[PDB]
């Protein structure tokens, strides 16, 4: 109370509710502890190894089984076995009349809160067969869609793997789109669209995906006897090295972990 404060009048704006949109601004939060700097650690004191696993690329790069198809005896050259859409949202549903279960890949789990995606998608194909089952598969990449008959060896991107030396193999579909970022359908929107057809070719070319990847037969399946051979192929799916997501959105506002009742 002796002198007079001659500092300048300093303007201010009150922020009662704070800053609840940005992810990096410090907060004026009354922590309900004794020490103001009360803080634990985030390490291998839970029994684990110590790796940060809330990275988007650490969750999405996990190779997860997605679907399975078969390669019949009656398949001949230029027969489509499966066709699938190049995108993150690789789910599979189990309906049972009141409930509808949605089983999602880690690639589809880690990309649901977002509205744009880009990058490469890795598909791991796994042929279950004996040593005496021989043939050639063929992996068409087509940015739009495949025609209703045979697909020519020119005018598409293809690989033609022999399954004698490589029964299991992965194929990385890079970014070849006219945009930089495609849209995200969400797990909510992927449950109504066809993304794995195995009877015809799926419809790509949408603003939501990066085209389509299809499996054809080049050489027929050779058999060691007269027994009926039921050969299957497994499709596992992961994120490639380019894979990025952006625009946090409303993709998971309608999802739930409780069944439909």
């Amino acid at each position: 109370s002796r002198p007079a404060v001659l500092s300048d009048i300093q303007p201010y704006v009150p922020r009662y509710c704070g800053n609840l949109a940005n992810s990096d601004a410090p907060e004026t939060v009354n922590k309900l502890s004794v020490d103001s700097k009360n803080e634990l650690i985030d390490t291998r004191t839970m029994g684990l190894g110590g790796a940060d696993e809330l990275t988007i690329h650490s969750i999405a790069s996990r190779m997860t089984f997605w679907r399975q198809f078969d390669w019949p005896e009656s398949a001949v050259t230029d027969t489509l076995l499966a066709s699938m859409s190049v995108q993150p949202f690789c789910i599979d549903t189990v309906t049972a009349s009141p409930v509808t279960e949605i089983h999602s890949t880690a690639l589809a789990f880690a990309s649901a809160p977002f509205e744009t995606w880009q990058g490469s998608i890795k598909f791991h194909f796994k042929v279950v067969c004996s040593e005496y089952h021989r043939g050639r598969l063929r992996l068409v990449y087509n940015p739009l869609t495949n025609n209703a008959g045979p697909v020519a060896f020119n005018q598409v991107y293809s690989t033609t793997i022999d399954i004698s030396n490589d029964r299991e193999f992965d194929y990385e579909c890079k970014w070849t789109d006219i945009r930089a970022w495609n849209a995200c359908i969400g797990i909510d929107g992927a449950t109504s669209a066809t993304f794995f057809n195995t009877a015809a070719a799926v419809t790509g070319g949408t603003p939501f995906d990066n085209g389509t990847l299809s499996v054809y037969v080049v050489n027929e399946l050779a058999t060691p006897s007269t027994a009926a051979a039921d050969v299957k192929v497994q499709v596992w799916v992961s994120a490639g090295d380019d894979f990025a997501v952006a625009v946090p959105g409303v993709g998971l506002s309608q999802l739930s972990y409780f069944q439909q009742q």
Binding site: L20, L54, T100, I102, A108, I187, Q254, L255, Y257, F258
Partner: protein, 267 residues
């Protein structure tokens, strides 16, 4: 020869000369997005609206509304132990939560372990009567008994002053636990953070969905005065949830089974 690898991996010649070309575009987010989102731990620190609470639905007269809520947000759908009631597919009724699906609720049941502090905001919107000078207060519970989500009213308008003081001593606000208070007429926002105290526990079950019927060990009691006059019927409390700075999740064991449906008609 890399033929039953549990993670796969055998690169066959694909359709590109240049491997992973979108990492070599340094100035990509100067053109399209403006920002890059790499981790979920950065994105979990955005607050998101969870649920609203109406204090003039529990008691009568002038009283003190108290709400025992978990520190972790309750889950979005058809609970067997839900705090609301919706019309189901059999044209009947079933318990249901009319809360939002936050990113914390999304990410937590896909991990085994969970540890860390959790941040809340209580916003106090709506209408109110002109004769209020209430104090909104948050105070933490003990870590031995997890209390479920419950609502209680303590009457303050008795003829005896001692029987008002005995109601103010039934409250967690009167205890040695950590308490934050604010006046509703001047700030109306708490912005609290629940620390991770534990009885020798390194983590807890991140795949535990029944928070509204059991609670967790980071529960908090929210307390606010309310009167029985009209225009306080629209007085409510909004909960915004987020994640403290010592927060971590355990090992990823896959996405859970999900379900897609809109909200039913509330009955």
């Amino acid at each position: 020869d890399n033929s039953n690898n549990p993670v796969g991996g055998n690169p066959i010649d694909n359709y590109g000369t240049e491997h992973a070309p979108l990492l070599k575009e340094d100035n990509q987010y100067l053109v399209y997005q403006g920002e890059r989102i790499v981790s979920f731990k950065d994105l979990l620190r955005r607050y998101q609206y969870l649920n609203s609470y109406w204090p003039q639905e529990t008691g009568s007269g002038f009283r003190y509304y108290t709400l025992d809520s978990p520190g972790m947000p309750i889950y979005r759908g058809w609970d067997p132990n839900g705090i609301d009631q919706g019309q189901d597919s059999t044209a009947g009724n079933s318990p249901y939560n009319f809360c939002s699906m936050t990113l914390l609720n999304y990410l937590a049941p896909a991990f085994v372990c969970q540890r860390g502090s959790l941040r809340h905001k209580w916003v106090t919107a709506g209408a109110r009567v002109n004769s209020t000078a209430s104090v909104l207060s948050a105070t933490r519970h003990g870590v031995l008994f997890p209390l479920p989500l419950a609502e209680t009213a303590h009457p303050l308008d008795n003829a005896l002053v001692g029987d008002r003081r005995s109601e103010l001593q039934e409250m967690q606000r009167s205890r040695l636990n950590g308490t934050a208070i604010t006046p509703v007429r001047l700030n109306n926002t708490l912005e609290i953070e629940l620390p991770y105290y534990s009885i020798g526990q390194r983590f807890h079950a991140s795949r535990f969905l029944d928070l509204a019927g059991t609670g967790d060990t980071q529960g908090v009691e929210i307390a606010c005065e309310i009167s029985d006059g009209g225009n306080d019927a629209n007085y409510r409390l909004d909960q915004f949830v987020s994640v403290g700075e010592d927060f971590t999740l355990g090992m990823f064991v896959g996405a859970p089974i999900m379900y897609f449906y809109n909200d039913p008609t509330a009955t």
